[PDB]
Structure formats: C-alpha cells, structure tokens
C-alpha cells in the first residue's frame, strides 16, 4: 500500500520484498485453524488465490511504475513444491540460485540453465 500510494502520485518507485514465501507460510500456519481442508502438501486450499491477490497489485501502470525485486525461498531446495511453482508465473525475470554451485564457491550462485527473462 505504501508503494501504491507513491505510484499513484505519478512517481516511479522501487519495491524490495525480503522474503515473499513467508506470506504464504504464515497463511498456511493459520489456514487449518480457520477450518479449511488441507490441499497438496498441507498447503492451504487457497494458495494460488492468496498469492495472486497480492502479486497482481504490484505492477507498473500508465500513471507510474514500480520496479521490484522479490526473494523467494524454496523449501527443501524443491523447485517443484507448490509454493515456488505457483510463484514462477508472476515474475518477468526469474533468477534461480543453487546450492550445488555455491558449494563450489562460485558466487553469485546463479544457475544459468534455469535463469530466464521475458
């Protein structure tokens, strides 16, 4: 909401989000208490809607622009877990880091066969 106020003023903004995975994780921690049946790997049934209702309003527009960078923790290094798998779609440039490269000391440990950009 702060970034959106600055955008509507016609400015152009930078928005850095330090770990967006924790939004979905805090949603999971609370989902079952709200009485909602578990889904694929215990994730809330509304994972993709919760995630889209946020990532859709972080965008540039004809009046002002938002650039953004989001860190996306992938649990257990499993790039196919539902949470990264549903986030890949919402990004323009995706940079995938990997432990089997960092352990070689090659920082930044970007995997060039898995990074990609629109």
């Amino acid at each position: 909401t702060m970034a959106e106020k600055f955008r509507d003023e016609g400015r152009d903004v930078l928005l850095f989000v330090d770990n967006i995975y924790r939004y979905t994780l805090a949603g999971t921690e609370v989902s079952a208490l709200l009485g909602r049946m578990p889904s694929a790997v215990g994730y809330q049934p509304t994972l993709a809607e919760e995630m889209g209702v946020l990532q859709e309003r972080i965008t540039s527009t004809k009046t002002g622009s938002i650039t953004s960078v989001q860190a996306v923790y992938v649990p257990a290094d499993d790039l196919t877990d539902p949470s990264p798998a549903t986030t890949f779609a919402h990004l323009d440039a995706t940079v995938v880091l990997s432990r089997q490269i960092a352990s070689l000391g090659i920082y930044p440990a970007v995997d060039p066969l898995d990074s990609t950009s629109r």
Partner: protein, 69 residues
C-alpha cells in the same frame, strides 16, 4: 649363422622377394591416400563397448543426485 659350437637360423614368416614386397608397399601407399580405414576384429571389445555405451545413455545421474563436480 654358424658359429663353431652354436648355430642359429633367423627364419622369416612369409616368402620375402622383391616384387612380393613391392605389392605390399603399393597397397600400404594406396590405403593412406584413399582413406580406407579397416576395422579391427575384436568382437569382445565391440560387444562390451556397445553395451557400455547403451547402459550409460541419458542416465542423467549427476543431475539427479546433487553432486557438485
């Protein structure tokens, strides 16, 4: 070759003449310009190598286990 108390006969494996050897020389010269690379005949190596090539194909093992390399 005869020595007083020893003698040895340094024999040859095939008939050695002049025109016999020149045929071999000409054939060896031909095979070098015309690249006629003949095959060996080690069938055991052929079978083992082909099985070893097939078995290792598209294993993708090193992508599957997370060895760094």
């Amino acid at each position: 070759e005869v020595q007083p108390g020893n003698v040895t006969v340094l024999a040859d494996t095939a008939i050695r003449g002049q025109d016999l050897d020149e045929a071999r020389a000409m054939e060896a010269k031909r095979k070098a310009e015309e690249h006629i690379s003949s095959s060996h005949g080690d069938v055991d190596y052929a079978q083992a190598s082909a099985e070893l090539a097939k078995a290792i194909a598209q294993l993708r093992v090193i992508e599957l286990t997370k060895k760094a390399m």
